[PDB]
Design a protein around this ligand. Structure first.
Ligand SMILES: O=c1ccn([C@@H]2O[C@H](COP(=O)(O)OP(=O)(O)O)[C@@H](O)[C@H]2O)c(=O)[nH]1
Ligand SMILES: O=c1ccn([C@@H]2O[C@H](COP(=O)(O)OP(=O)(O)O)[C@@H](O)[C@H]2O)c(=O)[nH]1
Lengths: 376, 376
């Protein structure tokens, strides 16, 4: 037990997973562990440099000989070079593919029997939904990792179902860094963005993929809007943006839906919101829910995946069946009309997420299993 | 000794290397070995199906989760699946990167201690000329292979110099399949392509990269052309095509240089040629020289790399310093004016390449080292 030398690999900019992996490394470095990120040359935005937190980055070039940019090999070579230069104790890889495989290859290249934790975020299920070429790679990356974790219990279950492995998968929930998301409401920025100070605000934040079911979110909002003057803020960009814009026209809510594009400072938008919606068809955890909940925003989610673990239906928010804009709008109208209900769920919610998703508690759990695999 | 179950991975369409790897597999399958190609979905053009020669191919898709198409992992997974399904004895990987690494990863994924031969074609030197990110991967792929071969002695020497490894590298020359390149001259197609039946023809065949020094070839031809009515045929396409077209204008040989594009049936063009030129700055072997020489075409090459092993200066052709269009044109004019010299070099050449580069002899050498590593 004690100080560890840790190599972390993730996609630092790809959604929730990259945020989680980065914030976890920062928490570990603030405790005094020696933390090495090894990623491709993708930006990070670290605010305070630490001498014990080093970001190693690799360029993936094509050369005229490779048919494809050799990400897996270039990354594995860089991980192995950090293992040798800094005598790393363990690797923490995010995603079975490509990153568990990269860590396994880097272990071979380094000649050191380093321990490997792999954390599953749900992308390995997504890949297999498109085609089964990688079925054997995902099974191998899971089974040759020393410890495997998943960001929800639902994801651990789904993994066993789809991958067909006896490998133990440890559910360890996601978290937000509490000082990045102060619990507070602020109406100062509302006018800037064309929202009247009193107006109710519903927010959704995502990559605008079809799996997010923004169609259900806009349909929900249209039903809300005819009872309650309100705005729907949609943060992000992606494949469904134009079809969703068109949907707001067909439902006659175009002037009330704000497509604000990608935003780095999401905290300030949660601070002006009244409800957060994540009605996804598939979702291992749902980090935007937790970011909003920590801010104090009461959530409505679907019952897909881990969302029903994040939200306690009827206690800290509401959960609806996938695609049920009737029930979602019913709950939203009640929450926007009923301050007693809103205050009660919000109070329950703030206590619950402190209890189950606090950054200190989750970091302790990862740290515990780092040490467990180092002692096996 | 005897029958082997062999997995071969190469880029089937990338230059000489892909031709060599494919033709070697065909030779092995014709002997009765069980030959499995495992490549990405890149065409092959096999003329006769054999029950003991199977082409496995893998799609490399992006999925929205991978930042780069995961070639290395998808290929390694497919190799491992063939190892398990067909109980392969050994892998023959072409290129230290990516393919030696893929074979090494596939060995881990398969759970079988399969033997791995890696053949170096020179691309690993080229990659490192552009940047040194992959230095450690190339060393690892070489050192963790059971046997490493190189297509020339020059390349083995260069590898030791640049990679800094004590690993034994076995020079095994390239070959052409003799019935694909009958020794014969044919003027029937000359008129079709705007060449008078008697006109002397110089040919060059390449990927039109700067390393091929087609500028030296066109400068050589311009000096030839003012003494001898003649045509320069340039087969292929690539980055230097437009600058080379412009060069033929500046030298006033535009009407005498035929840019014929990429050609699959190169044999028919060698059959109408009088000289072949390969004046490359870097070149591990120079397969187009051997294809032309087997056809009966006398070569002029540079002294780079393995070209001076393929050509015996003054005996089976001529070798010049890189960029020396003065000497190259001097030799070319002599060969095109002097049938005694031409016939003598051509006779020496046809005997020499039968002795050192015959397909049966080279296949025997690969087969010998397959068996050697299976017995170690
Ligand atoms: O404009 C945006 C959109 C998303 N996110 C962040 O992206 C994460 C998860 O979003 P996403 O839909 O991209 O992927 P998934 O949640 O499915 O991982 C959350 O931390 C968001 O705060 C952000 O910062 N700005
Ligand atoms: O139009 C062409 C150009 C090249 N090649 C073949 O490509 C190989 C080697 O060519 P390249 O310059 O592409 O690569 P390198 O020789 O450097 O490997 C030889 O077998 C050629 O016959 C071909 O078949 N048709």
């Amino acid at each position: 037990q004690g100080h560890m030398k840790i190599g972390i690999t993730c996609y630092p900019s790809m959604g929730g997973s990259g945020i989680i992996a980065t914030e976890l490394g920062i928490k570990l470095a603030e405790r005094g562990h020696e933390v090495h990120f090894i990623t491709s040359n993708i930006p990070f935005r670290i605010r305070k440099p630490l001498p014990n937190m080093i970001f190693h980055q690799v360029e993936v070039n094509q050369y005229a000989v490779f048919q494809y940019p050799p990400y897996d090999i270039t990354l594995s070579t860089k991980i192995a070079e950090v293992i040798k230069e800094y005598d790393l104790d363990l690797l923490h890889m995010h995603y079975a593919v490509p990153h568990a495989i990269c860590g396994i290859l880097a272990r071979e290249m380094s000649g050191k029997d380093i321990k490997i934790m792999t954390t599953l975020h749900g992308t390995d299920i997504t890949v297999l939904g498109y085609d089964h070429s990688l079925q054997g790679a995902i099974k191998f990356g899971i089974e040759k990792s020393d410890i495997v974790t998943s960001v929800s219990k639902s994801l651990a279950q789904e993994t066993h179902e789809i991958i067909e492995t006896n490998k133990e998968i440890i559910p360890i929930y996601n978290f937000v860094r509490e000082n990045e998301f102060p619990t507070k409401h602020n109406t100062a920025l509302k006018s800037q963005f064309g929202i009247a100070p009193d107006e109710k605000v519903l927010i959704h934040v995502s990559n605008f993929r079809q799996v997010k079911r923004i169609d259900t979110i806009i349909e929900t909002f249209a039903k809300v809007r005819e009872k309650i003057p309100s705005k729907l803020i949609l943060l992000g960009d992606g494949p469904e943006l134009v079809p969703m814009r068109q949907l707001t026209k067909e439902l006659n809510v175009e002037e009330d839906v704000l497509f604000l594009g990608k935003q780095d400072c999401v905290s300030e938008f949660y601070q002006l919101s009244d409800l957060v919606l994540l009605l996804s068809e598939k979702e291992s955890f749902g980090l935007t829910l937790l970011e909003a909940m920590k801010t104090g925003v009461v959530p409505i989610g679907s019952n897909a995946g881990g969302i029903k673990e994040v939200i306690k239906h009827g206690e800290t928010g509401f959960v609806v069946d996938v695609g049920d804009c009737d029930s979602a709008s019913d709950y939203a109208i009640r929450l926007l009309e009923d301050k007693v209900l809103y205050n009660k769920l919000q109070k329950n919610m703030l206590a619950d997420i402190a209890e189950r998703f606090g950054s200190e508690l989750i970091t302790d759990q990862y740290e515990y299993y780092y040490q467990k695999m180092l002692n096996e």
